């Protein structure tokens, strides 16, 4: 009876790159909004909804690494941003911290979304160390501003990409690995909303776990065979790309999807993996979906919050 509206908003260059790559991948039932100062980059956006901010400040250029210009640009386009958001039940704001537009405009966009009634999740990167300390300090201020503006925040330090590449992995391939954090989080929530579970979770449960909750982890794991449930649960909670690990989580939304063979025993095994990894007394909202078209694969979705 309730069908939640999810939007993904890219802010600045890195955020709009993420939006374009997610659209290429193919999302469905998610709406995308592209926000930038940089008219050149914005012109190449694949997003249905595009908002050029700050044209009077920048003349259609980017913000030249000045976050105050990104912030003013967003504020002066508040009404256009409100209009594009209106109706969203959930908004993901994605941005690369450290430049001028994401750093300054992304917290404004998040504040607007939350004031408009949307559950508001930020997924942002910190710069590579090779970009230098000024970029890092500027990024840190953006992260802090994002935390103040969102319901929950996922931070991806770009330095962690250096942990998952070999000497030849293309830069674009590494970037797609960072994108997956947002894409699979969005997809997991979309699927949770769309499908009726045997133990049914819904958007009210997402809100309980994510509303006004600080740092977050969103993870998906898929596995087959023996120890599938343990293996899928470990994959869901163990991304090498995250600033915030599962350790310390006090609230967890966990959904297990499997075929008719999904056993009670393996459901407990998977839940225990998350409980034990948290190393906390976690408040868990547990769900299950039986998809008969699944044979031997199991999918574990985890949203974790409450680090404190
Ligand atoms: N992982 C990733 N990081 C990016 C990407 N584009 C930019 N960055 C990072 O994001 C930071 C800000 O860059 P950018 O978004 O282009 O600046 P802005 O347009 O002024 O918001 C950079 O310092 C990089 O660390 C991307 O596509 N993927
Ligand atoms: F390119 Be960002 F606007 F500094
Ligand atoms: K559901
Ligand atoms: Mg730019």
Swiss-Prot record:
**Disulfide bridge positions per record:** none
Its subcellular locations are: Cytoplasm
Q: Name one GO cellular component term.
A: cell division site
Q: Which residues form a coiled coil?
A: none
Q: Which GO terms describe its molecular function?
A: GTP binding; GTPase activity
- Major place of localization? cytoplasm
For this UniProt record, the keywords arranged alphabetically read as follows: Cell cycle, Cell division, Cytoplasm, GTP-binding, Nucleotide-binding, Septation
Ligand binding (GTP)? 13-17, 100-102, 131, 135, 179
Could you tell me the superkingdom of the organism this chain comes from? Bacteria
Protein's GO biological process: division septum assembly; FtsZ-dependent cytokinesis; protein polymerization
UniProt function note: Essential cell division protein that forms a contractile ring structure (Z ring) at the future cell division site. The regulation of the ring assembly controls the timing and the location of cell division. One of the functions of the FtsZ ring is to recruit other cell division proteins to the septum to produce a new cell wall between the dividing cells. Binds GTP and shows GTPase activity.
Give the record's subunit note. Answer: Homodimer. Polymerizes to form a dynamic ring structure in a strictly GTP-dependent manner. Interacts directly with several other division proteins. Interacts with FtsA.
Its family? Belongs to the FtsZ family.
Q: What is this protein called?
A: Cell division protein FtsZ
Q: What range of the intact protein is shown?
A: 12 to 316 of 390
